[PDB]
Amino acid sequence: ADAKTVQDTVTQVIEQNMNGIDNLMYMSSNSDSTGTVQITLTFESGTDAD
Amino acid sequence: MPNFFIDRPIFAWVIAIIIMLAGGLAILKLPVAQYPTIAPPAVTISASYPGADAKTVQDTVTQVIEQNMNGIDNLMYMSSNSDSTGTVQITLTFESGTDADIAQVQVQNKLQLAMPLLPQEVQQQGVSVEKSSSSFLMVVGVINTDGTMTQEDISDYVAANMKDAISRTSGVGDVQLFGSQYAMRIWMNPNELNKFQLTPVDVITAIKAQNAQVAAGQLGGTPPVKGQQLNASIIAQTRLTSTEEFGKILLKVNQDGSRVLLRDVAKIELGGENYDIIAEFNGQPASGLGIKLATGANALDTAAAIRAELAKMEPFFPSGLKIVYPYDTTPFVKISIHEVVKTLVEAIILVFLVMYLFLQNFRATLIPTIAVPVVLLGTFAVLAAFGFSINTLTMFGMVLAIGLLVDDAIVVVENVERVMAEEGLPPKEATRKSMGQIQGALVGIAMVLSAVFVPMAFFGGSTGAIYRQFSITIVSAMALSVLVALILTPALCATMLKFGWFNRMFEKSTHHYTDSVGGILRSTGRYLVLYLIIVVGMAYLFVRLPSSFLPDEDQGVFMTMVQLPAGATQERTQKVLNEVTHYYLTKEKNNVESVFAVNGFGFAGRGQNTGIAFVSLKDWADRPGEENKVEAITMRATRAFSQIKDAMVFAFNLPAIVELGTATGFDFELIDQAGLGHEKLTQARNQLLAEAAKHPDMLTSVRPNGLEDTPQFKIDIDQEKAQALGVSINDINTTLGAAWGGSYVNDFIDRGRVKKVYVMSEAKYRMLPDDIGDWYVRAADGQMVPFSAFSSSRWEYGSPRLERYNGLPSMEILGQAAPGKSTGEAMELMEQLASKLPTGVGYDWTGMSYQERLSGNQAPSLYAISLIVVFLCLAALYESWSIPFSVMLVVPLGVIGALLAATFRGLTNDVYFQVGLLTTIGLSAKNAILIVEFAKDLMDKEGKGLIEATLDAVRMRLRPILMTSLAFILGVMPLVISTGAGSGAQNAVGTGVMGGMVTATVLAIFFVPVFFVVVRRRFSRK
């Protein structure tokens, strides 16, 4: 029961903070109707996944 | 090797080009920050509990949380604060180079298990965890100079439309808003409320139901029916989004069609979340934003981009929202970069001027000019190699060292112009011979300078890290150089190599000189004494010379500290800030560019009581005479602010590395080490504090960095009476609670952004202990009851800042050493004074005092090893367990006169000194090894004079020294040693090297050719 709702509620926020983290090339989230949310960060190659 | 190199110089340029290439491309890949990372890595831990107090917090949260920090890896110590506003900070500094990212984890991850335990008030606000820095890069400010927007409004904007826009910009390693974001305020009033028989709870528990977010499946989705066609999504109840929608909330309805709406019982309006910390820029409402570096980014680079992004977006939203920059650590860095660069550049101009005046040439002075930049560039690639960066520290590192490579250069091209002179051969054969008579020496002195240098970068914690910066720099330059002076220079001067007031006034002073030195050498140990004085002298000056870390410097800014007494008030505080502002703007109008002043940010607590005023001056330029400088502007202020009502108002200049180990002072912490409550420990503390002021001998200012008990109004619900009336102990509290300290109901959305919803009494029904009687609670049978019915009150003391060292009840005291005595000895008393406190009470050193205690004194233990490696290395340079002795006895010379940073000017043993003090012991012993080299060499090869050689030796040498030792001083003499601004360290570096460098030559020209003589005859003698 949540159009935008999720995004800007959980998406935006979680995204507001994903700043700092080193070796970040690009971020790309896709907020979903079902309430499901998937932010995804990807880093400069070589970088240390853990 | 050079001999195989002079032959193919064609190649030894490829070796030089590459270096230059790497060094250049490494410039670009280099980060640039004011200073590097030198604080050991700490991690704080915050928390809230709207309406509390130290017990009510240290008991519900500081602890319990701190009960579990256990598992966490390399932890040094964990301190913790429990203040009266519901804040809880519980920072934990960790061992030297542990991975900050991985300690934030655990710490953090280990809170994760205590939360089940934290109370629901707190876990809602959320405890957060981060890496402790709380003063960095720049701090944009956002004011409105047309009274339209209040604090809160401005904060919002800055939150809603610019905060993230910045936050993601090449650099911005973290942003931190200076204010809130709106939040659905809801200020009740027991009157308009008790009139309906509703309580806070009644309101709370409606703003819940009425404003929430429900669920309701799709239409198909989950298993449907055969042949369905429309699947859609139901959208039921969703959050209110306005003071409008909020105004309308059904709170009561009673036989009348009676509509009692939240709008009635209180008053609705957007507003701040927290309300106690009035920020304002030059008497204007403000709401800045702080921005920390980035980790591996570029202080210049990223400042510019921040400025770029702010631009581009400032053409927005009505009433002038002008963006101020009351603080930018960048101009400061640039001017430093602009300096130093000159120093280096000019340092060479010097090597052109000088040397000409000595070597009739031009194609000669073109050699040290192709060598310097070649050495410098390239050390910029070693820096890069070790992950280093371009910061204040690392810069001066090369300036403190400009004098060691330049020299090396000269030293080579000036032996060749001797060999092809003292009945010498052409260019080639000259080098071959020349660059082969200092060959081994140029090496060897390598290994020697590697010691008496390396040794640093082995020191302590917060410092040491600094020392490392200088060490690798110098030793990277230094030894990189020695490597070109065996490759490029010995091919460069060969292949390229071919007023009466000198030459005609030198060729004879040399002679007079060597002649003068000639004889005065029979009774060898003539000046063996005299010298002994010199040493004995230093071992005086040294102890007499004061100590420091980094000389404080004028910077864009500094601050004033206000402090209205025990139980004051934001309002009674502001006025003090308004003055502070005034007696700065308008009485200092040609310097104070702006004052950014906030009340509620004290430095030992918060609360309406204290505040603090940051002030940004005008450009160092528009601030000419000393009088117009910081270490001067604060002087006026500090005083000018005395003669102020009950309001301690200090002013003071921040230290060089804001986030790092302050004064030479100490930081002590007295421990409760058992039972003994707050009080016992206060008696405990006051025993020793008093016991210490009776000892100004060992100097002091032993002061409790903490906050005295203040009186406090204590309710006290009468359970039994509550039982008799129909009155729930829970309903009581939420009503007194919410009322007076405010509760945070739930959230709502406002222009596409979730934001909190608070709800608490209007201010007009919660200022004085009376009023409590305005508040009414609905009982079982449904009749409102008043406080007195089930509750009594009394005053009393309790503490508004409960501090606490590792896990235990603690209290923190700090103070200085002694205008005569050492920080170290100063500690020791403080520890004896602690040796006799009541049994219970423990004591423990933290902070600066932790390192200082732990490591601290090692300069002996370390340099011992160098003075040994030096001996060893040096011995093998020659071939004797004794001859090296004639090289070391140079150390003292250069030292003294260097130490005339006491007797000539007014300085201290501060880092920048000691680095220099090293750079100076390098040329000195470098000189020694050469003179002692040409001493043998032609004494060993040509079996020449046991003493005859030593004269000849010095002869073919007095020019090298004189040559270099000139371009140097003159090179160090400039703005370095005589400066106005963005300096400090400039005076630092120079003065040290300026003197001592004098004595290193003008005193070694006689001794080093001695020494060699004094010995080389004490061994295998009669």
PDB file of all heavy atoms in Angstrom, chain B residues 472-487:
ATOM      1  N   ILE B 472      60.452  10.332   6.437  1.00  0.00           N
ATOM      2  CA  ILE B 472      60.503   9.745   5.120  1.00  0.00           C
ATOM      3  C   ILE B 472      60.752  10.782   4.031  1.00  0.00           C
ATOM      4  O   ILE B 472      61.519  10.533   3.103  1.00  0.00           O
ATOM      5  CB  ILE B 472      59.335   8.871   4.781  1.00  0.00           C
ATOM      6  CG1 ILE B 472      59.260   7.699   5.739  1.00  0.00           C
ATOM      7  CG2 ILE B 472      59.553   8.274   3.386  1.00  0.00           C
ATOM      8  CD1 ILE B 472      58.940   8.151   7.027  1.00  0.00           C
ATOM      9  N   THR B 473      60.134  11.952   4.152  1.00  0.00           N
ATOM     10  CA  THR B 473      60.373  13.028   3.235  1.00  0.00           C
ATOM     11  C   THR B 473      61.895  13.191   3.072  1.00  0.00           C
ATOM     12  O   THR B 473      62.499  12.886   2.013  1.00  0.00           O
ATOM     13  CB  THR B 473      59.744  14.298   3.784  1.00  0.00           C
ATOM     14  OG1 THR B 473      58.414  14.001   4.165  1.00  0.00           O
ATOM     15  CG2 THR B 473      59.685  15.385   2.767  1.00  0.00           C
ATOM     16  N   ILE B 474      62.532  13.641   4.139  1.00  0.00           N
ATOM     17  CA  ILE B 474      63.940  13.976   4.041  1.00  0.00           C
ATOM     18  C   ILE B 474      64.700  12.781   3.517  1.00  0.00           C
ATOM     19  O   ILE B 474      65.295  12.841   2.460  1.00  0.00           O
ATOM     20  CB  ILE B 474      64.444  14.443   5.370  1.00  0.00           C
ATOM     21  CG1 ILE B 474      63.833  15.807   5.604  1.00  0.00           C
ATOM     22  CG2 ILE B 474      65.936  14.452   5.366  1.00  0.00           C
ATOM     23  CD1 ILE B 474      63.849  16.244   6.968  1.00  0.00           C
ATOM     24  N   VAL B 475      64.592  11.663   4.202  1.00  0.00           N
ATOM     25  CA  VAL B 475      65.357  10.520   3.810  1.00  0.00           C
ATOM     26  C   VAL B 475      65.019  10.033   2.400  1.00  0.00           C
ATOM     27  O   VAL B 475      65.681   9.148   1.852  1.00  0.00           O
ATOM     28  CB  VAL B 475      65.106   9.412   4.767  1.00  0.00           C
ATOM     29  CG1 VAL B 475      63.863   8.652   4.336  1.00  0.00           C
ATOM     30  CG2 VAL B 475      66.322   8.497   4.869  1.00  0.00           C
ATOM     31  N   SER B 476      63.966  10.578   1.810  1.00  0.00           N
ATOM     32  CA  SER B 476      63.588  10.121   0.473  1.00  0.00           C
ATOM     33  C   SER B 476      64.239  11.026  -0.527  1.00  0.00           C
ATOM     34  O   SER B 476      64.911  10.568  -1.446  1.00  0.00           O
ATOM     35  CB  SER B 476      62.088  10.073   0.302  1.00  0.00           C
ATOM     36  OG  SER B 476      61.629   8.920   0.989  1.00  0.00           O
ATOM     37  N   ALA B 477      64.054  12.326  -0.308  1.00  0.00           N
ATOM     38  CA  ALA B 477      64.820  13.354  -0.987  1.00  0.00           C
ATOM     39  C   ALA B 477      66.302  12.998  -0.865  1.00  0.00           C
ATOM     40  O   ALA B 477      66.904  12.558  -1.851  1.00  0.00           O
ATOM     41  CB  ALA B 477      64.545  14.713  -0.368  1.00  0.00           C
ATOM     42  N   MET B 478      66.839  13.144   0.352  1.00  0.00           N
ATOM     43  CA  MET B 478      68.235  12.928   0.683  1.00  0.00           C
ATOM     44  C   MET B 478      68.787  11.777  -0.111  1.00  0.00           C
ATOM     45  O   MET B 478      69.550  11.975  -1.041  1.00  0.00           O
ATOM     46  CB  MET B 478      68.400  12.691   2.199  1.00  0.00           C
ATOM     47  CG  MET B 478      69.812  12.593   2.740  1.00  0.00           C
ATOM     48  SD  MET B 478      70.639  11.092   2.163  1.00  0.00           S
ATOM     49  CE  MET B 478      70.380   9.808   3.380  1.00  0.00           C
ATOM     50  N   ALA B 479      68.407  10.569   0.215  1.00  0.00           N
ATOM     51  CA  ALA B 479      69.029   9.486  -0.483  1.00  0.00           C
ATOM     52  C   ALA B 479      68.690   9.430  -1.993  1.00  0.00           C
ATOM     53  O   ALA B 479      69.428   8.810  -2.773  1.00  0.00           O
ATOM     54  CB  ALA B 479      68.762   8.171   0.217  1.00  0.00           C
ATOM     55  N   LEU B 480      67.601  10.071  -2.428  1.00  0.00           N
ATOM     56  CA  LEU B 480      67.285  10.059  -3.860  1.00  0.00           C
ATOM     57  C   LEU B 480      68.355  10.843  -4.531  1.00  0.00           C
ATOM     58  O   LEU B 480      68.991  10.384  -5.460  1.00  0.00           O
ATOM     59  CB  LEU B 480      65.955  10.730  -4.131  1.00  0.00           C
ATOM     60  CG  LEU B 480      65.161  10.250  -5.354  1.00  0.00           C
ATOM     61  CD1 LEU B 480      65.734  10.810  -6.661  1.00  0.00           C
ATOM     62  CD2 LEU B 480      65.061   8.703  -5.362  1.00  0.00           C
ATOM     63  N   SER B 481      68.543  12.057  -4.030  1.00  0.00           N
ATOM     64  CA  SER B 481      69.675  12.916  -4.419  1.00  0.00           C
ATOM     65  C   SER B 481      70.980  12.125  -4.598  1.00  0.00           C
ATOM     66  O   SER B 481      71.404  11.920  -5.734  1.00  0.00           O
ATOM     67  CB  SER B 481      69.872  14.070  -3.424  1.00  0.00           C
ATOM     68  OG  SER B 481      71.172  13.987  -2.822  1.00  0.00           O
ATOM     69  N   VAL B 482      71.571  11.650  -3.493  1.00  0.00           N
ATOM     70  CA  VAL B 482      72.838  10.907  -3.522  1.00  0.00           C
ATOM     71  C   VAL B 482      72.896   9.944  -4.673  1.00  0.00           C
ATOM     72  O   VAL B 482      73.943   9.688  -5.253  1.00  0.00           O
ATOM     73  CB  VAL B 482      73.098  10.159  -2.212  1.00  0.00           C
ATOM     74  CG1 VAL B 482      74.029   8.996  -2.429  1.00  0.00           C
ATOM     75  CG2 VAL B 482      73.694  11.125  -1.176  1.00  0.00           C
ATOM     76  N   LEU B 483      71.754   9.424  -5.034  1.00  0.00           N
ATOM     77  CA  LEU B 483      71.703   8.569  -6.180  1.00  0.00           C
ATOM     78  C   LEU B 483      71.875   9.328  -7.546  1.00  0.00           C
ATOM     79  O   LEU B 483      72.411   8.778  -8.512  1.00  0.00           O
ATOM     80  CB  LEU B 483      70.422   7.739  -6.064  1.00  0.00           C
ATOM     81  CG  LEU B 483      70.204   6.589  -7.005  1.00  0.00           C
ATOM     82  CD1 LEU B 483      69.543   7.173  -8.314  1.00  0.00           C
ATOM     83  CD2 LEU B 483      71.539   5.817  -7.201  1.00  0.00           C
ATOM     84  N   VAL B 484      71.448  10.584  -7.636  1.00  0.00           N
ATOM     85  CA  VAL B 484      71.640  11.315  -8.897  1.00  0.00           C
ATOM     86  C   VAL B 484      73.061  11.838  -8.939  1.00  0.00           C
ATOM     87  O   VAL B 484      73.684  11.939 -10.015  1.00  0.00           O
ATOM     88  CB  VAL B 484      70.635  12.506  -9.132  1.00  0.00           C
ATOM     89  CG1 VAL B 484      69.189  12.080  -8.967  1.00  0.00           C
ATOM     90  CG2 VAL B 484      70.946  13.674  -8.238  1.00  0.00           C
ATOM     91  N   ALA B 485      73.569  12.197  -7.764  1.00  0.00           N
ATOM     92  CA  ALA B 485      74.957  12.634  -7.663  1.00  0.00           C
ATOM     93  C   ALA B 485      75.902  11.436  -7.876  1.00  0.00           C
ATOM     94  O   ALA B 485      77.091  11.574  -7.711  1.00  0.00           O
ATOM     95  CB  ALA B 485      75.242  13.368  -6.341  1.00  0.00           C
ATOM     96  N   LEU B 486      75.387  10.273  -8.258  1.00  0.00           N
ATOM     97  CA  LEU B 486      76.255   9.207  -8.717  1.00  0.00           C
ATOM     98  C   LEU B 486      75.895   8.824 -10.124  1.00  0.00           C
ATOM     99  O   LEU B 486      76.552   7.976 -10.741  1.00  0.00           O
ATOM    100  CB  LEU B 486      76.151   7.987  -7.832  1.00  0.00           C
ATOM    101  CG  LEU B 486      76.758   8.060  -6.435  1.00  0.00           C
ATOM    102  CD1 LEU B 486      76.374   6.820  -5.661  1.00  0.00           C
ATOM    103  CD2 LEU B 486      78.289   8.193  -6.437  1.00  0.00           C
ATOM    104  N   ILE B 487      74.829   9.445 -10.632  1.00  0.00           N
ATOM    105  CA  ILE B 487      74.394   9.171 -11.996  1.00  0.00           C
ATOM    106  C   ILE B 487      74.333  10.363 -12.914  1.00  0.00           C
ATOM    107  O   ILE B 487      75.125  10.427 -13.828  1.00  0.00           O
ATOM    108  CB  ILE B 487      73.114   8.377 -12.060  1.00  0.00           C
ATOM    109  CG1 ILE B 487      73.268   7.088 -11.256  1.00  0.00           C
ATOM    110  CG2 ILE B 487      72.855   8.013 -13.495  1.00  0.00           C
ATOM    111  CD1 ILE B 487      71.982   6.387 -10.938  1.00  0.00           C
TER     112      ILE B 487
END
